[PDB]
Structure formats: C-alpha cells, structure tokens
Amino acid sequence: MSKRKAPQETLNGGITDMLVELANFEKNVSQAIHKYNAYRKAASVIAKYPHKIKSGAEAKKLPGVGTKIAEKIDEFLATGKLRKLEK
C-alpha cells in the first residue's frame, strides 16, 4: 500500500488490474469457481500484454480472452476516450 507515488486515476490500460480484481473477489469468485478460471487465463495473457487497448479487437488476438471477459476489457477503456486538446 503506497509504494512511492501512483497516479490518481491510473494512466489508461489498467487491464490486468481490474481482471485480477475479480479474481481477488474472495467471495463471489474466490477459488474453484466456474467463471473464476475465466479471469485467471484472461489476466495471464493481459498482464503479460503491454496493457491499454483502444480497439476491442486487441483482446481478440490475446489467446484465452475473446468470448465473455473481452467485453470487460473494453469496459475499463470504455469511459477513457476523452480528447487530447487539439491545437
């Protein structure tokens, strides 16, 4: 908790962070669950991935992800399509 100085709203991706969060549920999705394995594989290829993906097709190329959790990936970067101040 509190290592040096983390951002207030992360940078952009934060994919493996919210994917591992569902695996950390320890209640609705603790261990030996039916969908708990979905986040274990999708998070194994996402966290290895450079993270951050504007187009949803990115999670498609990621092996193990691209059927149900792929929508949750875009959910992270779904409300982060703000502009970057033009000119």
Swiss-Prot record:
Annotated positions of the N6-acetyllysine modification: K72
Post-translational modification: Methylation by PRMT6 stimulates the polymerase activity by enhancing DNA binding and processivity.
Catalytic residues, chain numbering: K72 (nucleophile)
Intracellular or extracellular location(s): Nucleus; Cytoplasm
Cross-link (Glycyl lysine isopeptide (Lys-Gly) (interchain with G-Cter in ubiquitin)): K41, K61, K81
Ligand binding (Na(+) 1): K60, L62, V65
Residues reported to bind K(+) 1: K60, L62, V65
Sequence positions bearing Omega-N-methylarginine: R83
Function, as annotated: Repair polymerase that plays a key role in base-excision repair. During this process, the damaged base is excised by specific DNA glycosylases, the DNA backbone is nicked at the abasic site by an apurinic/apyrimidic (AP) endonuclease, and POLB removes 5'-deoxyribose-phosphate from the preincised AP site acting as a 5'-deoxyribose-phosphate lyase (5'-dRP lyase); through its DNA polymerase activity, it adds one nucleotide to the 3' end of the arising single-nucleotide gap.
Domain notes: Residues 239-252 form a flexible loop which appears to affect the polymerase fidelity.
Similarity remark: Belongs to the DNA polymerase type-X family.
SUBUNIT field: Monomer. Binds single-stranded DNA (ssDNA). Interacts with APEX1, LIG1, LIG3, FEN1, PCNA and XRCC1. Interacts with HUWE1/ARF-BP1, STUB1/CHIP and USP47. Interacts with FAM168A.
Annotated protein name in UniProt: DNA polymerase beta
Species: Rattus norvegicus (Rat)
Gene behind the chain: Polb
